[PDB]
Symmetry: C3
Subunit: 253 residues, 3 copies
């Protein structure tokens, strides 16, 4: 329940994993997910953990996401099939993948004390990053671990801007009375994957007041993934020579 609603990054295959060294080809980051278990009857499939080949304070596993995330928690766990585990570690991270930073200026975070009991560390403040790395500092037996990172869910948007949708000069809004429209079909440069929402706002106004009142409007109608109808309008006795608008359409997920 503590990590309820959060994204399990490794379990969802949301990150690339790079390690400093691997003991051999069956002790790699392929075997790093929290609660990873393998065939206990066969030795050939290796460790229930990522295990390094060099045992020093310079090893690490780094998880990289191309989409920034808010990291709430890192969970550590020992090796499932042997008495090896990381007792403390530091966390480093980068948001822009140019400059790196250290959590708590590099101070240790409390790890685990056995093979299987997970220890969650909720960061003192949530970390905004693309890439994050566990750097083992002290260990029992060997530098061997399983892990997970828990992030807020991400949302993804795609936006298209289109400029200068125009009624034309001396348009139909410039004669008659009551509610009047000039409809201009608009087609997006590319079709959205899901239905967009559309903002559509004025950039050029050429209109005549009526008993001192300005009455002008622009609104999308019949929004699809492919485009929409830009509806310019006026009402009452107003005469409107022209209206121009820019649009911003955004689809989510």
């Amino acid at each position: 329940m503590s990590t309820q609603g959060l994204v399990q990054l490794l379990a969802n295959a949301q990150c690339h994993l790079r390690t400093s060294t691997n003991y051999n080809g069956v002790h790699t980051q392929f075997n790093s997910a929290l609660n990873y278990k393998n065939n206990g009857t066969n030795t050939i499939d290796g460790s229930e953990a990522w295990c390094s080949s060099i045992v020093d304070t310079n090893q690490y596993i780094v998880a990289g996401c191309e989409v920034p995330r808010t990291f709430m928690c890192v969970a550590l766990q020992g090796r499932g099939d042997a008495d090896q585990w990381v007792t403390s570690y530091k966390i480093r991270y980068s948001l822009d993948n140019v400059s790196w930073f250290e959590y708590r200026n590099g101070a240790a975070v409390t790890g685990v004390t056995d093979r299987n009991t997970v220890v969650n560390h909720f960061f003192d403040t949530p970390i905004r990053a693309r890439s994050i790395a566990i750097h083992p500092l002290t260990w029992n037996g060997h530098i061997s671990l399983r892990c997970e990172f828990y992030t807020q869910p991400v949302q993804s948007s795609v936006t298209q801007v289109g400029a200068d949708i125009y009624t034309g000069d001396n348009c139909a809004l410039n004669t008659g009375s009551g509610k009047r429209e000039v409809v201009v079909p608009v087609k997006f440069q590319f079709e959205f994957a899901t239905l967009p929402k559309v903002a559509l706002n004025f950039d050029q106004i050429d209109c005549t007041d009526a008993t001192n009142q300005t009455r002008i409007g622009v609104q999308p109608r019949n929004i699809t993934t492919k485009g929409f109808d830009c509806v310019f309008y006026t009402w009452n006795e107003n005469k409107v020579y022209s209206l121009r608008a820019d649009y911003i359409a955004t689809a989510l997920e």
Copy 2:
């Protein structure tokens, strides 16, 4: 090949992370999972022409994870290149938000393959919008061994910058004179776009005098580059414009 023309081949294009339940050993891993992967047939040490599991039961899987949502059209399954092992039926599971997972067809079996090399495409009953997708073998011949591909619609990526409150100043130069008149306010984006953006630039504050009952006001970008643009406020005819304010939305694609 024709049936998936124009679709993105995820594994071929290295567009997903692959995680497996188990790997037989270090030369039977997801590194060997791509459709039509072939290796050195004269040397045994490079392993299988397939991902092969370690535990042989109904709880195995390969998960493909994408950080950017995709419309999955099809999954292609193929047997192992170098030995008589293949998956004969499987289920598909997926997640869009990476919090809740769902089973395609409520977990009903999907038809797999019947030999080493003949690909069997499954186009999903309805295309699936997802970030992560998993193949869960249900029945097999010999061992749990496969090569696979996922086909998605091409994705488009945009990057957007909003800037607020580009302003003429009070009692600006548009508030005197006749004919077409402009006040130009250079705008620099917070960061340089990778490619040329398109720019929406629209009013949020208007302070103007009509001219024989006509309002005449405009704002338009000029000289748009990846670094910024010129915000041109204007009026025309005999109109006097005290001030105009605008916000901008600039978006670059791909």
Copy 3:
């Protein structure tokens, strides 16, 4: 330094890596990062390089990113622990991951001449792409390499469009004198990860002039990750019957 300020993709775990073949499970792309070094006293952790299984002109390593990048440079390096290196190679790439292209129309790019001296190749023109591949053409000893790709920093945005925030008909701005506001609170469909910037622009105007002057405005106040206050206003003697606006809110990184 020639690559200062650029993102090191492999170092930052920003790409998936697929290879044509791997010599065995300790000669894989897990060992491919520039300057990768392993345990030199133990043979079991394999090569300081990705090494192919098949030695021909058809091998490759592909780096894939879901987020388009601007590729500035590819760095090649030999194998750290043996006299094997790639002397020339070609580059191929794809932006849409459907159509692929060859750099220099397939012509050779100069590789390396020893184990450890890095040779940077800055592309004739930067390449905009999602996926990129090194294809060895000639080699010493075996097809064995370490590498890096250097890209411009990327920025990520998330955008929400909200339509039709409205004062109501015959709103409070339609009476009185002096600066007057009507405040409409707005909650975004979802909470942004970081503080957004907000564009808020007119789509319907219904107002009276005052001694021929139009005076109208709309502005966000108290923007948070969760929403903002939409402030519609007028001033002086103007009477405004109604105003309507659409918003566009974007958060970076």
